[model samples]
Target chain A: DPFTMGVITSESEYVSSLSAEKLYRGIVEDGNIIYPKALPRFIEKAETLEGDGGPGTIKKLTFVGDFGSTKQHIDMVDRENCAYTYSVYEGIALSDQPLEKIVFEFKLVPTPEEGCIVKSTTKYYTKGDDIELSKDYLEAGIERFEGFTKAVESFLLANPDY
Target chain B: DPFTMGVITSESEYVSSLSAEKLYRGIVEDGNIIYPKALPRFIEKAETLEGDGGPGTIKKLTFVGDFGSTKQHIDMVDRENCAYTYSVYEGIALSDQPLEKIVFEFKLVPTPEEGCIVKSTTKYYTKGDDIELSKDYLEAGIERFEGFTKAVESFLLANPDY
Candidate 1:
């Protein structure tokens, strides 16, 4: 009964000017820790292994969202710009959520001109009896990514020289 | 070294389900204060004086933008939701320039259904050697307001029950 209250699912998107590659590298390097600062009090910090991007990478993301300082872990990562998977690991933790998994994929499409379009999709897989509660966490995670995308876009727009 | 950082202006629209009367009261009571919070790191806090929102009504706005802790005092107010004038009086205050006077006007128009469209126009008055500089400030302020508008739209979308 304790773990059931802390689960949720949802999807969100972020359109940015930064190349998908650059954004991907930033996420892997910073582990989304700068999100809270860049996007006003959403992401707090991420606990991740020290290494370059690749599989078997572990990243623990914490956030103060529609709920609170909920944390999740990315147990696996595939950085060819295709997709990756993560799940709820632990933290100042919530209750009732038995298991949760999130997979994010980025698709790059060429535009008519020199620029291109970046489409990002996130899928949530919640196991056990707490699927409903896990949806919010999933949605919040997606929203954070979208917010970061907007920030990156704004930065790129402002710094055209770069 | 001192340099010119060219300006960029942006505009956004908010979907108000309320009529002109409610919209006017809301802005007077809560709109002016609650609107800026939607921006990422814009206003830290917004406070307004008591009354139905007329001229001489003061609203204090504070934010940490590129320069940090920018405070702007809104001087003019109108119940008809037509327009209002705002000036930077504290925190990264602006000096004399080509356009010293900044006015924001809010207009409500009926949509096809029960919805309403809120349009805002910002006018900048330039002066002396600060012509370009003031223009940049105008652009930045407009961009920030767009962010604020988006935030408000987001709130309404999420809180349909509200």
Candidate 2:
């Protein structure tokens, strides 16, 4: 079995059209729910636990199919700068694969007008026995990211009151 | 005829969501070309003059009707608390209308999820002779406000990233 990591880049003037607070509130804070509303199928439950989006906030992700559940601990959350970094610790572990820990980060920048720029990135690391499974996670991760972006677009187009 | 103002209440969870900075930035600071795109029948353009949002800061509103042109001289704009209060000091004055000026005030506060409460009020005072004309301006103002809100909703629905 082989493990592979991939990246997907998506840009929308829509994101650039929203204020930082609205962007974070709509996508980052309640992202699990919003993402599902946008994608509809892939994600099962994306629940957030405790805190003012600061350190120690926990986000649980459950995918459709054999992939089951993966929980990530938010290691860093910068409210001032509007950025967050997280890592998957326990739950579904892909051993002996190409990637082991899934690292992700998102940043928001103010654009001209009441608009902003959102940059999302994910990194996959694997170790022994986790190679093939890591590949699967990588593909799934890309799908999730793309799906999430598409959902954001859909929601923005549907609801602008935010 | 008795003239009464319309009350529009908006609620936002995010304090920054209601901040006037975002509003001004969205319309004046940010490129508001989309306003025309959303309200193709009305609003021709929203161009800002050189100056911070204050006295002499001119904002031109181009309409589709014979109203032709209207320029507002900023009476007040407070960026610290994100509030703006201005009046149309110099613009196309309707003949026989007793109304002296058209004024607006906007305020923003923080909420749980970056939501906002927007309330707009228009005051009309009759000059005795052009009382009916004043009524027309008041009605026109309401229509323009509602139309602007609709355009904003369309913009948000089309772009989720914002």
Candidate 3:
């Protein structure tokens, strides 16, 4: 068994007309409860399996795609900076690939125009450095992920009560 | 019967540990609704009489103090800057004093420490230029008013959901 370790990272930024705090509040802090309601592209449920929604908690995300469910562990939650981190430790997505986990980080900063700068980074840790995972897969995946976030943004924007 | 028009203004600022958006969202935009719940120091109700709590709207504030109720007209709402202006057009406080109205302006700015600088200005419009409003009155009134906001801040700090 060839046991090598390597990480592939992807970073993206978006400017939103919504506020930083609102954006952070809706998607990050309350994401576990809201994501399923906002978008039906993949996830339909984010049930907390252990601890609170803060750091060290684990969530079982039930999906509607070909795969059924996966697990994510909360790594960090800095509400002050609107930053959060989580890693997917189990899933069918990793079954075919030589990957250990996918870690995601999000940070939002307010702009002068009453909007926000949203930054997202995803890191894929491979089980072996010798394994080759196609990088182009992210271009479509990235667009889809952003589409997921915008769906929520649109939900919150249209429904002010949210 | 003396009828001279004049205005006396008092302005003050305080730094708070809360974010500007949170402070503004709690106190300004939702003040009419949240004020009654956040603090029982002076007001009990802010019943909107006309319009939708925006400019040209009138709110009847039922107070718990010696005075019962007063009518305030919303003059402006600048959510972008977290600034709002309103005027108390009718109340017992204006009956004894030779004043036509009391105008209040609130603006909040964010700080680097995830805090905010809360600024509040009060303008007393006298019915006549000859009539005098004791400046010493505001020293205690301002202090009391600041206490009102602090109480609400304390409520929101304890209740993260709010």
Best-fitting candidate, scored by DockQ: 1
Residue runs of model 1 more than 4 Å from their true location after superposition: A1-162, B1-19, B31-33, B36-42, B49-53, B64-72, B81-83, B89-99, B133-139, B160-162
True contacts kept of each: 0.00, 0.00, 0.00
Q: Using alpha carbons, what is the TM-score of model 2?
A: 0.38
For model 2, what is the alpha-carbon lDDT of residue A117?
73
TM-score of chain A of each: 0.54, 0.65, 0.87
Worst 10 residues of 1 chain B by lDDT: B62-71
Per-residue CA lDDT of candidate 2, range B87-151, in tens? 66443234334345566555554355654545454444333432344233345554455446445
Error of 2 at A117 (Å): 2.2
Looking at model 2, how many pairs of residues clash?
44
1 or 2, greater by DockQ: 1
Q: Provide a comma-separated list of chain B TM-scores, one per candidate.
A: 0.60, 0.62, 0.84
Q: Which model scores highest in TM-score?
A: 3
Residue-by-residue lDDT tens digits, candidate 1, A72-108: 3444554564344444333212233334445554454
TM-score per candidate, chains pooled: 0.41, 0.38, 0.46
The whole-model C-alpha lDDT of candidate 3 against the native structure comes to: 0.68
